Structures are given as C-alpha cells and as structure tokens.
Design a binder for these strands. Structure first.
Ligand SMILES: [Mg+2]
Lengths: 54, 155, 41, 181, 184, 298, 145, 48, 51, 213, 203
RNA sequence: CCAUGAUAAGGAUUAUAAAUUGAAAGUGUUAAUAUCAUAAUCAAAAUUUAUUAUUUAUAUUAAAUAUGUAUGUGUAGAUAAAAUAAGAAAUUAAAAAGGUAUUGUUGCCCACCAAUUUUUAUAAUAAAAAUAACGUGCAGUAAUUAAUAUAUUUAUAAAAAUAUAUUUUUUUUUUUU
RNA sequence: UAUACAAUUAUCAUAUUAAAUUGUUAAGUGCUGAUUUAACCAAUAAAAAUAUAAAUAAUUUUUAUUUGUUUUUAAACACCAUUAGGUA
C-alpha cells in the first residue's frame, strides 16, 4: 500500500544501515562531475540588486 | 535476452576443418617451394611422392551421416545379419567354441573352432539337414572331439 | 529492409560483356533503327 | 459458478448449494478416485498415496492452474510447450548420466571379478552368504525368513510438497518459494 | 552476427530455416516455399543428419562411399554365379521411393486447440493400419493376387537380367560400365 | 557487533586450537595396560583349557601317496566315465547369466521348491499354415478358456452403499476448509463448520495458514465431535436408535488439492474410535473448458 | 559443464543426495525402530539402534563412492558431452520457431492459403445450445468465418 | 610473426591470373582479372 | 603444499644470525646471505647442539 | 556434430580393440598371473548396453487385438491407456499410435455420452494393472527412463564388493589374532611392539575421543 | 618456482607423446605398421611434429589420409571383421620411431610415456573416442588436468579449505612467503611472518 | 571563513600446523588558489553537548582544593559486549538469472507546459520540422502490477484500463504409480 | 550538375489448388447458515465433451471472394462512481 518513492527511500536507508569507487572510476567521477564537494565559482565583481551583507 | 556465455567465442562449425585439411597445406607448400626461395621441409619432400587420398571429404561438407569417408576410421562389420545370428546362437549354445579361439586375446594366426563349426553347418545345410538338426549334429561332433581329447588327457 | 540488395560476389566481366550482344549501340551499328530525321549536319 | 470456481460451494445466508448429496449424488458420476479402505491400511496413507500420485503426474498442477485464475490459450500453450521442451532436454541430459552409471556398474563388476580371481569362486560365494554352514534346514530357514521379511515392499510414496499462497497469486500451481516468470 | 552481414547465403528469418537446397525433387528450389512435404525439425534427421535434408529414399545426390537406391524386386537368378553368394545388397523386396513419413506439423497438428495431450488433428493415411481388424476383414477363402495372376504388366522394364531373367556375367557394384562413353 | 548479527560458532576458529591432540582427551591409565593384558592372557588360557577339556586340541597330517589312486585313475579313464563327464560339461556349457551366488536367486529357487513341495503325431508346418487362427492364438496375449466375471463387471471396484452410512464431505480451499455430514437421503445433519465459522479464519498466521492442515484438522475434529451427539439424536428421533456403543459407518468424500486435506483425514483417523470409515472417495471438478475465470495479475 | 549451451544448475539432484528422491535401504530395520520408539514400551530401544547402525555403517562409504563417481561423471561430461556455452538453447518455445512456423504453414495451406497464424473466434460456454436459429453455433475456420 | 605464419605464395609462371576470380573476405567484394598492366588502387597495386 | 615446502619462512638458521628489521614487516640478516649452519655455533660433535 | 541419443561427441564404447587388455596387463601376462584370471577373460570385449527407444515415435502399441477390442462397449480396455482420473496420458509419457489415440478419444466420447463410462476416473484402474507393464525393482532394465533405478543397482553391486572386502579383511584380522594368541603374548609379540606399541593409544583401545557421551 | 621449472623441463616434450598416442589408438585401422611405407609415413610426421613444422591436427590428418594400398577396404574385409587392428604393431612402431630419432636424452622415457599414457587412459569411459574439437589444439580447449592423454589427468588435490571470520583480515598473518614484504606505510599493525605470539617450550 | 594531497574506526569462509582473532579506499591539525584579521594555557575559570562500564546498607573527609545528590518489587521502550587460559557442541556456507545506459541511474529517454523560428499554405485552415538549462510528472530502459500488436475508452502529460492476438519475459527434472 | 541494383535465402498489409460445414447435451434442496480477496465486495449456483476414409498437379486466380469489432441463460467484463457498484 505504500507509495513507490517512500518504499524506495526506505529500502535504500535499510540497505545502508544493514550493509568499488577505487576499483572502477568513471569519467564523471574523475573529472569531478558527480562529486557534490566540487562547485563552480562566480565572477568576483559585485552585483547591484543583491542585499548588502551584514 | 539470454545468450550463451561462450557464444561469442564459439568456433565456426562449418569451416573449422578447411584450415587443417592436408590438401590445403600440400598446395600452399607446393607453391611456396616452387617460388624457388623456400627450403622444402622433410614432410613435403616425403609426401610429394605419396600424396594423400583424394576422396576423404569431411562430414561437415558431405552432410551425409552414412558416408564412410575415412577408410582407416571405417567401422562396418563384414558379417551379414544371418551370419551374426548363426554365430551368436552357436556361442550361446556352447561357450567352449566361442571362447576357445579367443581366450584372453584374439590369436589371429590359429584356426578358429567357431569358423570350423560354421563351415560344417553350411556343409550340412547344403547336404539337406535343416537348421536345428545341423546345429545339434555339429555341436555333437565338437563334443566328440573334446571327449577324445579328454580321454587322451586322462590316459 | 529499407536497404537495397547487394551481390555476394562480383559478376563475371566476360558474362557481363557477353550479355550485351543486343545493346542499343549494337542495334544502331546493325542499322535496325530506321532514320526519319536529318541527323548530324 | 463452476464447481472449481473460487466462489463455489460458498457458505452464506442467501447461498444454497446446488445438487443432491448422499447416496446417488452430484459427484456420483464425477468421482475420479474411489478406494475401499480396509483394516490395517490407514486412510491417512491412502490419501497420501493418492496425493502423491496426482502430484507426481503433474495433474493437480493443471487443475489448480486452470481453475483458480483465467489464463489465455496462448499462455497455456506457451507453458505446456515450455514444459515439454524442458522435459525432453532433461531426458537427453539424464540419458548420459544413465550411460555413465552403467559404465561405473561395469567397473564395479570388473572389480568383483578381480576379487573372485584373487580369492576363489567358492570363497566369494561364502562371502556373499552361501549356505555352506547350513547343516540342518533350520540354518537356511533363518536366512530364508530374513530375506522373506526384507522382500516385503512397503508403499514407496513420499510426502507431497505443500502449497504456498503468495500474495495476489501470480502463479496458482506454485509449490516452492522460488520465483518464476 | 553473420546473418546480419551476409544475407544472400543465410536467412535468419523464421519459417525460412529450410534453406535453398536444389538437390530435392520438388517443383521449386525453395524448400521453405514448397508445399509438398513439411519438415518435422523435432524428430527428423535420425539417419539423414539435418532435418531439412531430403530423406534417404528421396535423395538425388550420392557420395562416393554411400550405397545407391536399391532395386525393388517385389538366389533364384544367381545360380550361374557364385553358389555361396547371398542376396545382393542392392536388391530389396520392399522399397518405396515416394514413401511418406509421419511428420507432426503436417499429420498430427495441435495448434488450433490448447495443445492438450488428448486432442489434435490427425490423419491415418500416412501410416499403414496396425489394427487386427485389417486382416480379419480382408481374409478370404480364395488365395491372393500372386496366385490369381491379375497383373499383366509385370516389371515396368521389359527384361531385367537381375530380376526377370537369369543373371550372367560378372557383378559391377561401382558404376563403371554403367557410366562410360563409347569410343566406337 | 557493529549493528550486525553475531556470526555462528562455526565461523570462529577452534576454541582449543592451542592444545595438543594428546591432551584432548588425556589417555591416562597406562600402568593398567600391562596388568590388563596379562589378565586377558590368563583368562584366555583358562578358556582354552575349558575348550580343550570339552574337546581335543590335536591336529595331524595324513601322508598320502600318489600311486594309491591308480584305481581312481583307471576308473576315470573308462569310456563311461568320460561320457558322463562330457555330458555334465555339455549341460553346463550353456549360456549362464549367474555371475556369482545371489541371495535373491537362492531365495527364489528355494521358494519355488517349497511351493512344489506344498503342491502320437506332432502337428506339422502345413497344418500350422492352414490354421490361421492358431497363429493369432500364439501371440494373442489375451485370456484363454474360463474367465472370471470380476474382470468383466464394471461395478466391482465401485463402492457398495448402505442406507445407514453417513457421508462426510471435506472441502479444502486456498484459504478455507470445512466439513459437512449428510445422510443417505441427503439431509444435512449439522450446520457447516468452516474456518470462518469456527474463528480460525482471519487471525494469527493470516493468509498463510488459513488453508493449512492445522486449521483443517481443527475444524474437522470440532465438526465431528459436535456432529456425533447430533447424529445420535437425529437417529433416535427418526426411530432407528443407535446401539450400545455402535460404530457409526462413515463414508469420507474429500475435495480440494490444497493443504486442508491431510489435517482432515488425520482428524478422521484420530476420531475413528467411533467413526468407522468404510469407504474413501475424492472428488474434483477437473476443468476441461468452461466460462472465463476472473482475470489474474500475471 | 554446459549441455547444449546451457549450464547445469545442479548435479546433486541427478545423484539424489540430500533430495526427495533418495534411496530406501534397511527399511525393515527402520520400520522396526520406528515402531519400537512409537510404542510406550519400558526402555529406549538401544538394541534397535545398534541394529540400524550396524546395517547403515557402510552408508558413508557408499555415499563417498557415489560422490567420487559423480565427480568422475562431471569430468567426463566436461570432456565430451557438452559444448561449454557454445550451442543455442533448446529448452524454450521461442527457440523452436521453425516447428511452429511449419504448423502455421500447414494450417494456412489447409485454409486456402489466406489466414496465417490465426485462430477461430471464441464462443460462449453454451453457444451450440443457447444460440437461436440462424446463428452459427460451431466455430468455423478463420478463413471460413 | 602472424604475417610470417600466414604467409602464402603463387605460381609466377603466368605472371597474373588467366581467369576472373571473385571473392569476399568480410563482405568486401574483391575481383581479380587479367589485364595488360597492373591497374588497381595504389595499396592493392603495391601488394600485387 | 606445506607438506612439501615445510612450515618455514626463513632458512633454518639460529636466530642469533637474524635481526628483526625496521619499517619492513620481515626479518633480515646482518651478515647478508652468509648463513652459518647450526653446527658453527655449537662445539664440534655436540649433542642437540648444546655447549 | 552430435549424436542423436543424448548429444554425445564420441561413439559410446568400452573396448574397441581385441588386444588392449593384453597391452594393459602385459607385465602380468609375462609373469603368468593371468593364467586363470576372470576379469580380463570375460570383460575384454564388453560393450555398453543399447540404451535407446526402438519405437520413440510411438507406433508399436497397443497390440492388434487391443486395437480390435478398443471399443466404446468395453471400458476395461479403455481404462488400460487412461489415467486414474480419466485423462489421457501425454505423448511424452505414453506414446500411443495416432490410430490408437483417435480410437481411444472417440470411444471415450461415445461411452461418456451413452453412459457406459464415468466423466472422471476409471472403474478398471486396479484390474488393468496386470495389463500395465510393471518395472520390478529386483530385475534391472537397461533402458529405464529413470536414473535412480540404475544407481540403486550400482550401489547394490558396490555394496556386494565392499562386503567381500570387509569379510576377507575381518577374517584376516581374526586369524592373525588367533595365531598370535596361540603362539603366546610373550612369544608372539616382538620386542619393539612390547616396548612401545604396548600402551593405550587412539589406535589401541582409547577412551571416547568425543564429547557429550 | 624451482618445482615449476622442473615440471616444465620434464613436460616440454609431452606434445609429441600426445600425438603419438593419438595416432596409435584413435586410428581404427592404420594397416600394418611393420610395413616400411606406413613406418616412413609415421616417422616423417612424428619428426615434423617434434620440429614444430606441422601442427598436430594436420599431421594426424596426413597420417589417417596417407596412401596405403589400393582397394584398402576390400583388403581389410579379408583380415578385420570390425575394422579394428591389433595395437601391438602400432605401439612398437611408435616406440621405434622415438628410439631412432634423438627426441629425448633418455631412450626409455619415450617408451614409458607411450605405455603409461595408454594404460592410464584404458580405464576411462570411451577410452579411444575423442571429440574432434578438443582432440588437438584449438581456440577453445580443456583444462590441463582434464586433457585426454595429459600427465596430470588423475589428481585428488585439496580444493576445499575451511575459513574463519577473520580470514580476510589475516590473509597475511600466517606463515606466508611474501613476494613483496609489507611495510609500515601499507600495513599499520603487522609484526611479520616469522614471529609467534604464543610460543611453546622445547628442550 | 576559504586558502589542493597524507595515516583511523569498521570481524562472515586460504583451519591446525613446527603459526597472530584487526582491513588501504580514510580519520581536525601536514607540502602551490590568498588579499582589513593581534583571538592560544604559565594555574585556581562558564554542562545543553550523539558516541561514556560508578563505589549499593557492620566500622565512611589528614595535606596541592576535589563533588548535596536520584532509597522506592534487579522494575517500560530501545539497546551494548563476548565462543582467543579457559570450561558453552548436529541441521550449514556451497545454483542460474540484467544496460535502451557509455556523461553510464546523480544515466539516457517520454509527452505536456514554456520560448524562438522554418516549410506547405491565404482558406477565421491543417500538418510537419529544428532547439543545453523552465514547469508538471516518472511512462520506457530485467526499471518496482512485465513487455509487443490491433480495436475500444478515459484525459494536464507521459499514458492507463479492457477485448483479442504475441514474447527483442530472466529458466527450474512425471516415459502405463 | 552528368558518370552500371539484384536475380543462392531481404519480417508490415500483393491472399490466389484449397475440404470444408452441420450434430440437443449438461446442470435443478430451504431451512438457523461468515463464501472470495493484499483489502472492500452484492443476493439460488450448478452446468453445455463424438471422429475418420472421401474432393485431382496443370495449361484464362487474370474471374466470384476472403483474414481476432459479429448483437440472448450464467461466469468473465473497459470509461464512471467511492465505502466501494456498474461495464464486450
Ligand atoms: Mg517507471
């Protein structure tokens, strides 16, 4: 009776609790695509509409 | 979908013998030697005088299971079914006649009692004695000979 | 299916030339086409 | 409703069972198996042998499969042809095993002949249990009694597999937890 | 796959597994297109290899080490030859060239029904009846056709030295004198 | 451990892997070995003395000479002796399928022997040819001469019914099992006892043990134990009262191939103290081709 | 081992070891022990236990012999009975398309060469008995309609 | 080493084919015919 | 197999000649490759190599 | 290239040549050990059993008289080739002739319609057992469909050989013990055995080496 | 590694033994090996196989298709009933060819291998029947232990070993012989293979 | 603040034997990106924070100053540890079976929504095609009640449900009981 | 811009020599009542069983015409409703 997305999330969490990268490295992982730690930066120049800090 | 694991490396079942056919090697080596700049090997130097047989086409190309391509590997008994039945009946009636010729290994340079029994049976058949009576008479003759041998042994 | 048919091997050049025994050029050389125009100047 | 339908023989206030029962009944002409139970033959064993027969004959499978749910003619033909092909392939596989077991039996017989050669025919018969010590008839009678009791062949029927009622019953003839297409 | 690349020599389409064999006696060289005899792939090929190949009694191509079609006779005529020579292996008393064989797809067809063990369209003309009803109904006080002598044609050929007449000369197993060209 | 099940003791290495094999177990008591060996020798000597007193511990050799058996040799050299030896040889030269002594073969031949202990012109080939029927008799494989009517009547295997037997229907379904009892005329003696009727349906072990042998056994046993006084009072009212502890003749009729069948038959056998079962029948409507059943998920 | 290009999932079932289709041996002694332990009696039937153990002492050696014979059979099967995942499977209906194509060809040729792989229309359960006059009761061929 | 294992040779008494030979190794149709001179693509001509 | 190669990870030489190395999980030898037999340390013809 | 029986790659055989036994036992032949041997003498030319169905299609049965008698009026012969529940055997199990199956189905339909045969089951299943072939466990059949009926005979023969070996080894042990006792404990046992082997050990009368006793 | 080297040096010549055994046994009717024609055929083919100039499959085909005698089948009808000839002459010729040709330094090794590879195979199912694909070298082959006439055909080496829960961590804690010694950089806590933390007492 | 790298914890199958029951896949401090930065114990000090074995009812505060709190039927839920000089003993590991993804499920892909625009057309037309980021979804991709074909039907959209026919659905042994 | 398919086997609409069509049987309590289902559920509920032997391969199918929507007792049953039924 549960919905598909909730079932998937619960199953993933249960597998995580109950239970590779170096063996197999894909192009995205090598070039830092999938990695959420790497994030692009913006141009240093300040905008005009943004609220002033502090 | 399901595919056999070794289907990719499966050998071609129709053309995996043409590579190893002796005639292909013979022709290629003949051309190579005839070019004049190749030292002939000993197998070529010998088999040029004795080329292989011509009519040994493999079953892959013949596609006929009842074809006896290889004379060496041919296995077809020369005995007719009537002869097979006759000798089987004689051996079943008497184990002495069957085993006497062979024993541990077939001695091919000595006379066979089963062959002599079959010859006498054929002689009786053409004389006019039918199957059962001829078999009984020839077996009784063999037993008379064996009795003579045993009497000599006892003496 | 959308592709056309392709021969397994070539067609023998001798047979291809031999089948041309009644081509239009051969007919013209034999003079079968009757002339009704002016032709060349 | 057919007699094999899911809602057949239902017990309800408004539901009255069709047909006459007792003596000459609705099943009087439709009873497939009738056995006269006799003393020293338990009815539990009679039922066990009947169930083993109808299971090993792959007949209860078809009965349940056609009765509980509706399956298209294409599906039934597909399943039956798959079963036939698998059975034929298994017979082909088992023929090789039978041949190799016959060869192993020949090897065992050859080893027995080796033992006969190295011990003597009479010694091998005695080891096989020849009644060479049966001075009186009672000595051989004891072994005759033993083999007479051993000859008695009890029913070789075994316990039938249980039926598993999976959710929504994708397959109704399912008797094992193994998943099937 | 080889079928995807080469299609002039291989057909992977179902219903066309019969092939393009020209060595049959049928009205067309397309075995999958002919409608005389239908291949039973599941049981055929016991002694003829593949299922699509023609039967042993319907072959028109012969190997070097394979026996040809035996002559039907329907020994008496070998008195002049070796007395111990038994029956000639190339002489058969019961040999039918167009002898239909039982095939499930054509004779025992079950695709219309649910393919249950109890049903299936069957014709009994393919195989001679084994029932004891046959001889009992066809039992007569008078003798049979060979005694009554109702046949006037006899053998199709006028005179056969092997069958009709006594056989003289020497036997020729391999076709040597029968396959030769006159120089005169 | 780290939120994981503890592995079984088999996975762990040997608990006593660091002790010598002679320690586990210790074989102490070496000093008694010589004493017990000497005691054994002494008592064996005493038993040997007893056996020698009973009989004789003497052996001797007979110095046989070869010239003495010339009478036997002359007797064997005779024509009659050779003839009988050759007759035996011919008799045993036939094909023999007995490799070694077989207990099965010996038992069969002895059984046949004990069963035995307990118990002009020859027709010609032309005659056989003209007798066409005799050829069929040769390979008839059909009963010849007098034939028992028990193999011809079509009701011999069929049950023999009486007006007194009570027919007990045991229906087993996928999720239910119930037993009912009717008389010969078809009157329903007691109300039907289903799994839902008795409460087993829809409880613990739901959807799995509803049709199990356990629930079927329980419902059938309860139905029988409730029916028995009802059957007694029904017969008493009908005017044919039950006898003093009479066995009630029961005809079991079971339908359904589910699990609620073995439990039912076991309950019947457990209540067979009074329910004397006379006939057993199983009934099942095998589908050939009928109306469309409700569609499955597939 | 892969017979006809399909690997053998289990070879223990062929032997019968640890399976339903086992071999019955010393059934008389087993029955005697079962009856003795079922009856109330006076003491545990260690004598029947000794008899059964003496009967089945060689069962371990027999099982070892059959296991080594099964290993030798597996070796021979790999040697020459199979193809090691080389040939196409022959255990499913869609691997025998040619046979069913021949069946369809026979039916099509029977029905004037018009309908290929077509089945007669479904009819009611009592179609031949409840349909009125003027309506076809017995189903016809897909070409006959 | 593979080329030396699969090396072949031809009879040069004729110095060219005397009949058209048409084959196909991997679907590529190849035709070799007698001609007055070596007329073919650069690579196949160098091979010849 | 150990039944052939013996349960040895080093040549059977007295531990006096072997030193436990540093930064490497193996034992090394101070006199590299020059292995004195057991009888070298013991007096000539010594019972159980005793002094 | 496969065989038709079970897809074999080679021809089934045990011995192909008339002299391979002599080649294998050449040393024994020279030493004269095989003057009266039996294993070589009888199994030199042994060949595998012809394990195949001579009539796989199914046109062998029933008998012609059974064809004649297979009518609607007699349910006894109909029940012979009909299951216990009244269904027809599949061709995989019981391959009847096509004439046999069409006769059986038409006769069953006629008998059911008239009332001579029940719609389910057979009233002659027990009486048709004699006509039905019986696969005796005691007598082995080379062409059995099942492999258990062959493995049981293989086990029987192996157990017989093991019985021979066990009987002879125990007889040897008994005779050796008797001879040692007759010669005497002191006289028979050697000095080494009396000094070292004459103690309790895992091989010589040990205590129970197992727990939970 | 020393035993591996010794095994390789001993078995370097096994291919010729395999081919000679196949020629001796598989060929049903090779004819009369004593005849100099057949002897020369066999000797030349064996020399070619030993030199490597011809592969075993083609050499076997040459041997079985070489010219022996006109009307060979008709002549064999007189002698062989079933077409199977005695193997004594074949084995004698196969030993004589290797005795004459300096194949191996020890003359008796050739004869012993030829005899043993036959007597060991004689007790196997279908002893002289070989599938065409696996009979000789091919793209798809068999395991060295499962080859037909291999020197390592029969073995019962240990193939099941018990493993404890700490095995994947203590794979290198036993008496392992290290191809590369563990260092502190790789293994944080490991004393070495020569240490024993629970020593006994010895006199 | 941010200002590249590097050691940890985490036991599930190479076993007795002359032997060890702790892993490489990474843990605050360590070696290239800068662009207001004085945050550092030398005593006597300020719980709100996941990752910690405390002493239970005969005798009780002396040396650097050193714990005043919670007696309540060994008592809910939830949860921790050990088969190694300790003491524990018969039911257990050991099958098959997949990419439309290549950026490889954090993936391709689907219509609708939204935005630009092209072609046929001049009729208040219709149809078709191109497009990297939006919105609604998750339809398909062994893909979460299988998929394919035709017919009907519903409609925010992929589609969904039925009737019939198929498997480019991954598969599990009955030769007359 | 002009400049050489195939014809030995090609999966979306090119069917054309083929034996069909029709059988008249089965099932009939009301009784003190919990059947089916993952769950809800609706109202008498049991049922329809017969085949083969026989119709030429052709020279104008150039030619009629034909391919699972086919209308009524039950069992199945798609839109829609939501306490839950309709509908091939
Ligand atoms: Mg989805």
């Amino acid at each position: 009776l549960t919905n598909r997305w909730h079932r998937e999330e619960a199953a993933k969490k249960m597998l995580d609790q109950l239970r590779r990268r170096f063996e197999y490295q894909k192009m995205g992982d090598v070039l830092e695509i999938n990695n959420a730690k790497v994030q692009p930066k913006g141009f240093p120049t300040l905008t005009r509409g943004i609220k002033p800090g502090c | 979908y399901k595919m056999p694991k070794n289907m990719g490396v499966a050998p071609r079942f129709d053309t995996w013998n043409e590579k190893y056919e002796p005639w292909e090697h013979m022709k290629r080596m003949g051309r190579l030697v005839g070019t004049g700049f190749y030292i002939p090997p000993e197998w070529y130097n010998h088999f040029r005088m004795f080329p292989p047989i011509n009519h040994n086409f493999q079953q892959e190309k013949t596609l006929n299971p009842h074809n006896a391509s290889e004379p060496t590997q041919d296995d077809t008994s020369t005995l007719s079914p009537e002869r097979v039945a006759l000798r089987d009946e004689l051996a079943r009636k008497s184990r002495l006649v069957a085993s006497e010729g062979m024993r541990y290994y077939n001695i091919f340079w000595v006379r066979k009692p089963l062959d002599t029994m079959e010859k006498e049976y054929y002689e009786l058949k053409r004389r006019g004695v039918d199957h059962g009576e001829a078999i009984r008479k020839v077996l009784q003759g063999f037993y008379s000979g064996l009795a003579v041998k045993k009497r000599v042994a006892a003496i | 299916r959308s592709g056309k048919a392709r021969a397994f091997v070539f067609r023998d050049p001798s047979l291809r030339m031999m089948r041309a025994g009644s081509g239009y050029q051969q007919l013209r050389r034999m003079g079968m086409p009757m002339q009704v125009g002016m032709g060349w100047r | 409703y057919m007699m094999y339908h899911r809602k057949a023989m239902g017990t309800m206030k408004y539901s009255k069972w069709k047909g006459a029962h007792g003596g000459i009944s609705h099943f009087y002409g439709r009873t497939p198996m009738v056995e006269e139970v006799r003393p020293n033959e338990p009815i539990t064993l009679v039922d066990r042998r009947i169930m083993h027969y109808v299971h090993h004959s792959r007949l209860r499978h078809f009965q349940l499969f056609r009765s509980y749910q509706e399956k298209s003619n294409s599906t039934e033909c597909k399943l039956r042809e798959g079963e036939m092909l698998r059975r034929r392939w298994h017979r082909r596989l088992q023929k090789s095993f039978i041949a190799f077991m016959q060869f192993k039996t020949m090897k065992v017989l050859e080893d027995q002949a080796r033992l006969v050669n190295t011990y003597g025919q009479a010694a091998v018969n005695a080891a096989l249990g020849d009644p060479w010590n049966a001075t009186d008839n009672v000595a051989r009678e004891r072994k005759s009694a033993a083999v007479r009791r051993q000859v008695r062949a009890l029913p070789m029927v075994n316990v039938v597999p249980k039926h598993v009622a999976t959710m929504k019953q994708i397959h109704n003839d399912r008797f094992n937890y193994r998943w099937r297409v | 796959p080889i079928e995807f690349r080469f299609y002039q020599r291989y057909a992977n389409h179902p219903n066309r597994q019969s092939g393009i064999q020209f060595l049959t006696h049928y009205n067309t060289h397309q075995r999958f297109r002919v409608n005389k005899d239908y291949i039973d792939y599941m049981h055929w090929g016991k002694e003829q290899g593949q299922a699509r190949l023609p039967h042993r009694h319907q072959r028109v191509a012969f190997d070097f080490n394979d026996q040809l079609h035996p002559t039907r006779i329907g020994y008496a005529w070998f008195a002049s030859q070796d007395p111990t020579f038994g029956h000639h292996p190339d002489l058969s008393s019961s040999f039918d060239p167009n002898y239909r064989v039982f095939s499930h797809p054509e004779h025992w067809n079950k695709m219309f029904t649910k393919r249950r063990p109890g049903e299936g369209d069957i014709d009994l003309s393919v195989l001679p009846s084994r029932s004891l009803l046959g001889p009992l109904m066809a039992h007569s006080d008078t003798k049979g056709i060979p005694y009554f002598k109702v046949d006037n044609r006899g053998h199709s050929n006028g005179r056969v030295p092997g069958v009709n007449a006594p056989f003289f000369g020497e036997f020729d197993q391999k076709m040597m004198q029968a396959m030769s060209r006159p120089l005169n | 451990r780290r939120g994981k099940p503890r592995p079984r003791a088999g996975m762990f290495p040997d608990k006593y892997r660091r002790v010598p094999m002679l320690l586990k177990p210790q074989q102490g008591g070496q000093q008694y070995f010589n004493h017990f060996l000497i005691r054994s020798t002494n008592d064996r000597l005493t038993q040997q003395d007893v056996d020698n007193a009973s009989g004789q511990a003497h052996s001797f050799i007979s110095p046989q000479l070869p010239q003495m058996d010339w009478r036997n040799m002359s007797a064997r050299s005779s024509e009659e002796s050779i003839r009988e030896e050759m007759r035996q040889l011919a008799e045993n030269d036939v094909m023999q399928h007995q490799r070694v002594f077989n207990e099965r073969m010996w038992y069969e031949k002895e059984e046949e022997h004990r069963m035995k202990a307990r118990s002009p012109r020859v027709l010609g080939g032309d005659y056989f040819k003209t007798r066409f029927g005799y050829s069929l008799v040769k390979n008839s494989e059909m009963t010849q001469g007098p034939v028992d009517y028990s193999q011809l009547d079509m009701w011999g295997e069929m049950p023999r019914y009486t007006s007194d037997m009570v027919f007990l229907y045991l229906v087993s379904r996928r999720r239910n099992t119930y037993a009912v009892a009717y008389t010969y005329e078809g009157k329903r003696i007691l109300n039907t006892y289903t799994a839902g009727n008795r409460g087993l349906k829809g409880g613990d072990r739901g959807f799995r043990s509803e049709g199990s042998t356990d629930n079927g056994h329980q419902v059938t046993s309860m139905y029988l134990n409730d029916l028995l006084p009802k059957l007694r009072e029904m017969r008493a009212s009908e005017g044919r009262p039950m006898g003093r502890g009479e066995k009630v003749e029961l005809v079991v009729r079971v339908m359904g191939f589910y699990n609620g069948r073995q439990g039912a038959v076991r309950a019947v056998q457990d209540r067979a103290n009074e329910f004397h079962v006379r006939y057993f029948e199983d009934i099942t409507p095998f589908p050939l081709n009928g109306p469309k059943m409700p569609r499955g998920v597939f | 081992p892969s017979h006809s290009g399909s690997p053998v999932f289990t070879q223990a079932k062929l032997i019968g070891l640890s399976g339903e289709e086992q071999l019955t041996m010393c059934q008389s002694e087993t029955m005697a022990l079962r009856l003795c332990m079922a009856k109330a009696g006076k003491e545990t039937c260690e004598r029947e236990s000794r008899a059964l153990d003496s009967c089945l002492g060689r069962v371990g050696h027999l099982r070892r012999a059959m296991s080594e014979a099964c290993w030798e059979f597996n070796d021979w099967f790999i040697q020459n009975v199979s193809d090691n995942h080389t040939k196409p499977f022959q255990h499913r209906p869609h691997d025998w398309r040619h046979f069913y194509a021949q069946e369809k060809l026979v039916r099509e040729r029977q029905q004037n060469g018009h309908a290929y792989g077509r089945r007669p229309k479904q009819f009611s359960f009592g179609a031949r008995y409840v349909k009125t006059d003027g309506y076809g009761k017995r189903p016809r061929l897909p070409y006959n309609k | 080493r593979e080329a030396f294992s699969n090396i072949i040779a031809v009879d040069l008494e004729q110095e060219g084919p005397m009949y058209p030979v048409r084959v196909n190794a991997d679907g590529v149709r190849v035709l070799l015919y007698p001609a007055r001179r070596i007329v073919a693509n650069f690579r196949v001509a160098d091979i010849l | 197999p150990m039944s052939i190669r013996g349960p040895l990870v080093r040549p059977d030489v007295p531990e006096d000649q072997y030193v436990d190395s540093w930064y490497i999980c193996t034992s090394m030898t101070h006199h590299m490759g020059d292995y004195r037999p057991w009888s070298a340390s013991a007096p000539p013809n010594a019972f159980r190599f005793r002094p | 290239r496969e065989g038709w029986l079970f897809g074999q790659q080679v021809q089934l055989h045990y011995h192909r040549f008339p002299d391979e036994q002599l080649i294998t036992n050449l040393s024994r032949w020279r030493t004269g050990e095989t003057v009266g041997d039996i294993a070589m003498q009888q199994f030199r030319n042994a060949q595998p059993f012809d394990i195949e169905d001579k009539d796989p299609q199914g046109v062998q049965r029933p008998s012609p008289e059974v064809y004649m008698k297979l009518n609607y009026k007699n349910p006894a012969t109909i029940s012979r080739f009909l299951t216990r529940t009244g269904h027809m055997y599949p061709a995989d199990i019981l391959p009847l002739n096509p004439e046999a199956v069409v006769k059986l189905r038409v006769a069953k339909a006629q008998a059911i319609r008239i009332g001579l045969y029940p719609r389910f089951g057979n009233p002659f299943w027990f009486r048709s057992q004699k006509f039905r072939p019986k696969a005796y466990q005691e007598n082995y059949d080379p062409t059995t469909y099942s492999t258990k009926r062959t493995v049981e005979h293989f086990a029987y023969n192996w157990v017989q050989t093991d019985r021979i070996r066990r009987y002879f080894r125990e007889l040897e042990a008994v005779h050796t013990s008797g001879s040692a006792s007759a010669r005497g404990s002191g006289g028979g046992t050697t000095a080494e055995h009396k000094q070292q082997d004459q103690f309790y050990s895992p091989e010589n009368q040990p205590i129970s080496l197992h727990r939970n006793n | 590694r020393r035993f591996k080297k010794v095994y390789d040096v001993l078995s370097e010549n096994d291919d010729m033994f395999i081919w000679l055994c196949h020629t001796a046994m598989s060929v049903l009717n090779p004819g009369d090996m004593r005849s100099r024609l057949i002897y020369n055929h066999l000797r030349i083919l064996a020399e070619s196989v030993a030199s490597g100039e011809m592969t075993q499959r083609t050499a076997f085909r040459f041997f079985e298709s070489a010219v022996r005698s006109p009307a060979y089948r008709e002549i064999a009808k007189r002698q062989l009933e079933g077409g199977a000839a005695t193997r004594l002459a074949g084995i004698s010729a196969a030993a004589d060819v290797m005795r004459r040709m300096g194949l191996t330094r020890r003359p008796m090794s050739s004869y012993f291998e030829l005899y043993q590879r036959i007597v060991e195979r004689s007790e196997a199912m279908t002893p002289w029947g070989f599938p065409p694909l696996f009979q000789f070298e091919e793209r798809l082959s068999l395991e060295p232990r499962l080859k037909f006439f291999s020197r390592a055909s029969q073995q019962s080496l240990e193939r099941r070993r018990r493993g404890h829960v700490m095995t994947p961590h203590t794979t290198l804690h036993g008496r392992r012989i290290f191809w590369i010694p563990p260092t502190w950089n790789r293994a944080g806590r490991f004393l070495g293979p020569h240490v024993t933390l629970y020593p006994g007492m010895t006199p």
